[PDB]
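Researcher: We plan to redesign the surface later, but first we want a full-length starting point. Tokens attached.
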């Protein structure tokens, strides 16, 4: 006994865990309360947010008390010890599924918006959420099915602590096999899905980049070909430019504001047709004058359509970044503990990470259950405004 009494360091760890638990419950209860109250927040994307918040509420209510209990090494039946050690794996896996669903949902919205509402529905989302929770319990509790160290209990540690028959000193790394934690949980169930999310978000931002560039190209094609018509010398040159503009207009043609965008393209294709007939009749001056009327349609309809399409794309990029930040923070908070397990497993010649670092890595992982409500409040106005209403009306 040359080191400080364990209860002193335990007290700091336990106090910090309890602080994290309270904060995890408060913030994520607020998220669930906001979606339940505000119909503007009731969409498929946010149903996975609620599932994610539910997992974080359970981290504070169950996983953290379990972790505190594990840190004492109390005597326990091995499979009972195994359950409280593995339950957080269930919650982490649920978080992964929810995060992956959110990325996929945002990809469907950007890649095929015209058939998003018919493909992604609330009833289908609720069923997916239920399946993912079942799979999370199956994956997280796999050690309960026999992939555990309960067959080889550390009897020396058990006897030294005065444990009874069939009991062990309940310690995470004594009951949960490290090949499970590294190969099965980390590589297969955590790292691979996180890498898939990375690929999905790369496809989301690439798709958004491509669609914003295409919009700016059509706007340039319309204006360039208008100049070609104005400076044309014969009717054939006017026809060639008008033939291009017509195909582009019909290509760009694929609520009150929407009622005026449909009326705008009807004027545009009609005005292109009028000029195209004049050009085919060899009336070059009549065609140019008719083409000049397109500027009026451009100023009153086409330019406004371009700006709303651009605004909508930029809002999707902003939302996709918010979702990517959530997934990235999950990786940042959990990777240290995973990396420590890799050193324990792959470097038997390395000294085990010290107890204080284990505490720090565990606290960091649990802090992930606190951060999501802040991301929503800082990056999503509808959440921010709803949070204020709830706070001003019920807390204050
Ligand atoms: C739905 C929620 C509220 C129910 C919570 C039930 C939890 C707390 C229960 C369910 C199973 C229980 C465990 C089952 C078996 C054992 C083995 C025993 O030697 C020590 C206690 C221990 C480890 C129990 C601790 C408490 C426990 C984890
Ligand atoms: C960006 C984030 C996710 C990376 C964090 C990496 C952390 C977890 C890495 C960086 C350096 C690593 C340490 C480097 C050296 C040792 C000494 C060895 O005897 C036990 C493991 C231990 C103590 C490692 C534990 C994990 C460690 C602390
Ligand atoms: C893309 C990133 C975030 C994925 C994480 C990569 C992980 C798996 C990498 C990063 C650092 C790596 C460790 C670096 C050093 C050692 C010490 C060596 O004696 C055994 C392997 C071990 C323990 C490596 C295992 C794998 C490792 C933990
Ligand atoms: C020594 C500190 C107190 C006793 C302990 C431990 C301990 N040792 C580990 N090697 C470990 N690895 C994990 C992982 C679960 C999912 C991914 S990594 N955990 C659990 O993850 C956060 C907490 O819930 C904790 O119980 C771990 N706990
Ligand atoms: C957003 C990412 C997370 C941001 C938040 C930072 C993450 C850490 C959390 C709280 C401070 C850490 C408190 C440290 C408590 C663990 C150390 C401990 O228990 O001390 C052991 C003792 O000193 C000898 O055993
Ligand atoms: C949401 C409302 C708040 C409810 C939550 C607040 C009430 C719980 C308070 C304290 C629990 C303290 C946990 C006791 C665990 C002590 C373990 C200990 O000290 O022993 C360590 C071991 O013996 C050597 O490593
Ligand atoms: C809001 C409250 C609603 C919450 C919903 C509650 C529904 C729980 C249903 C079944 C739990 C079955 C118990 C599972 C935990 C026990 C694990 C177990 O039995 O293993 C320990 C073993 O006995 C060691 O010897
Ligand atoms: C939406 C809610 C979803 C929840 C749906 C639940 C799905 C559970 C599926 C697989 C886990 C089964 C793991 C096996 C549990 C075994 C516990 C047990 O009894 O083993 C200890 C033994 O009794 C002492 O030797
Ligand atoms: C940043 C917060 C990191 C501080 C976490 C506590 C560091 C700590 O406990 O110090 C290790 C010391 O050597 C224990 O013996
Ligand atoms: C803040 C949470 C309050 C922590 C008080 C309990 C300290 C842990 C202990 O009793 O050992
Ligand atoms: C984590 C920080 C969030 C703090 C939320 C404070 C208002 C409480 C509202 C509530 O949970 O009912
Ligand atoms: C578990 C208890 C905490 C969950 C409470 C969440 C309530 C908020 C919205 C649902 C109504
Ligand atoms: C014992 C297995 C059966 C358990 C029943 C399922 C568990 C229920 C868990 C949480 C209930 C909250 C579900 C979300 C409510 C949303 C309300 C709505 O759809 O409008
Ligand atoms: C752990 C327990 C936490 C889980 C409880 C949260 C359940 C529901 C929160 C509110 C979700 C909003 C559902 C809206 C459905 C709809 O709009 O039809
Ligand atoms: C509202 C949901 C409430 C859930 C309660 C969870 C809090 C309890 C957490 C862990 C239980 C600790 C079990 C410790 C067993 C010690 C018995 C012994 O000394 O052998
Ligand atoms: C909603 C909160 C859920 C209830 C949690 C209550 C807070 C208790 C926190 C940790 C419990 C730890 C109990 C000690 C484990 C057994 C240690 C021993 O046997 O010596
Ligand atoms: C509400 C949930 C229950 C909250 C507090 C209950 C008191 C917890 C006391 C833990 C004592 C554990 C121990 O004796 O080691
Ligand atoms: C034990 C684990 C319990 C997990 C609880 C799961 C509840 C979390 C999120 C439920 C989301 C409910 C959304 C309902 C939308 C359905 C609809 O739009 O019609
Ligand atoms: C219903 C939600 C709780 C189900 C958890 C029980 C399943 C496996 C543990 C034994
Ligand atoms: C999932 C469906 C079935 C798996 C349930 C198996 C129960 C595990 C028994 C634990 C044991 O006694 O070793
Ligand atoms: C994607 C994440 C997984 C990627 C590659 C799997 C790594 C395979 C591990 C080889 C183990 C080496 C050994 O036998 O010690
Ligand atoms: C056995 C381990 C189960 C693997 C769980 C990891 C989930 C990975 C991919 C799920 C489907 C991805 C769809 C894109
Ligand atoms: C481990 C890989 C890191 C996973 C990060 C997940 C999503 C970030 C997307 C960034 C584009
Ligand atoms: C292994 C590390 C890389 C993981 C995932 C990236 C997959 C490649 C992304 C596809 C991008 C295609 C596109 O931008 O159109
Ligand atoms: C490993 C992950 C490291 C940092 C995660 C930060 C958030 C990643 C999403 C980028 C958003 C653009
Ligand atoms: C990102 C993808 C993750 C890649 C994971 C790397 C795979 C294996 C790293 C660990 C291999 C170390 C085994 C060394 C065994 C020995 O010391 O002889
Ligand atoms: C913030 C401070 C973080 C310091 C600890 C976390 C990560 C860096 C790892 C430092 C190495 C300490 C363990 C190595 C050893 O003592 O043998
Ligand atoms: C990418 C910016 C943050 C840099 C890494 C921070 C996360 C790792 C912090 C501590 C790991 C040791 C516990
Ligand atoms: C011991 C208690 C530990 C508390 C952990 C810290 C909690 C802070 C929560 C979230 C931090 C991130 C909030 C800022 C996100 C801004 C989003 C953005 O604008 O890009
Ligand atoms: Na989580």
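Model: Full-length starting sequence:
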């Amino acid at each position: 006994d040359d080191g400080a009494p364990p209860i002193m360091g335990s007290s700091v760890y336990i106090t910090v865990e309890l602080a994290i638990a309270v904060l995890a419950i408060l913030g994520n209860v607020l998220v669930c309360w906001a979606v339940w109250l505000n119909s503007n927040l009731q969409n498929v994307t946010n149903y996975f947010v609620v599932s994610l918040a539910a997992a974080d509420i359970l981290v504070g209510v169950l996983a953290i008390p379990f972790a505190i209990t594990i840190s004492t090494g109390f005597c326990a039946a091995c499979h009972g010890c195994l359950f409280i050690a593995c339950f957080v794996l269930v919650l982490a896996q649920s978080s992964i599924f929810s995060l992956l669903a959110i990325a996929i949902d945002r990809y469907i919205a950007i890649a095929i918006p015209l058939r998003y509402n018919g493909l992604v529905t609330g009833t289908r989302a609720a069923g997916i959420i239920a399946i993912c929770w079942v799979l999370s319990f199956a994956i997280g509790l796999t050690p309960m099915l026999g992939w555990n160290n309960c067959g080889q209990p550390k009897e020396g540690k058990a006897h030294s602590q005065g444990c009874g028959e069939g009991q062990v000193a309940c310690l995470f790394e004594d009951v949960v096999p490290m090949n499970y934690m590294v190969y099965f949980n980390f590589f297969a169930c955590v790292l691979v899905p996180l890498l898939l999310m990375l690929g999905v978000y790369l496809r989301i931002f690439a798709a958004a980049r491509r669609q914003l560039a295409d919009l700016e190209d059509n706007w340039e094609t319309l204006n360039d070909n208008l100049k070609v018509i104005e400076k044309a010398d014969n009717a054939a040159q006017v026809k060639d430019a008008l033939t291009k503009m017509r195909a582009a207009a019909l290509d760009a043609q694929k609520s009150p504001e929407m009622k005026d965008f449909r009326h705008g393209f009807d004027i545009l294709v009609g005005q292109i047709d009028d000029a195209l007939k004049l050009a085919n009749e060899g009336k070059v001056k009549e065609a140019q004058a008719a083409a000049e009327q397109l500027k009026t349609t451009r100023n009153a309809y086409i330019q406004k359509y371009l700006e709303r399409a651009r605004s909508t794309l930029q809002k999707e990029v902003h939302a996709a970044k918010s979702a990517a930040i959530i997934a990235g923070l999950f990786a940042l908070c959990w990777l240290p503990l995973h990396i420590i397990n890799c050193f324990t497993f792959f470097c038997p010649d390395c000294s085990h990470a010290p107890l204080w670092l284990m505490y720090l890595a565990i606290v960091l992982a649990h802090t992930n259950s606190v951060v999501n409500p802040f991301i929503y409040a800082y990056r999503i106005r509808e959440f921010r405004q709803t949070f204020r209403k709830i706070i001003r009306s019920h807390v204050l």
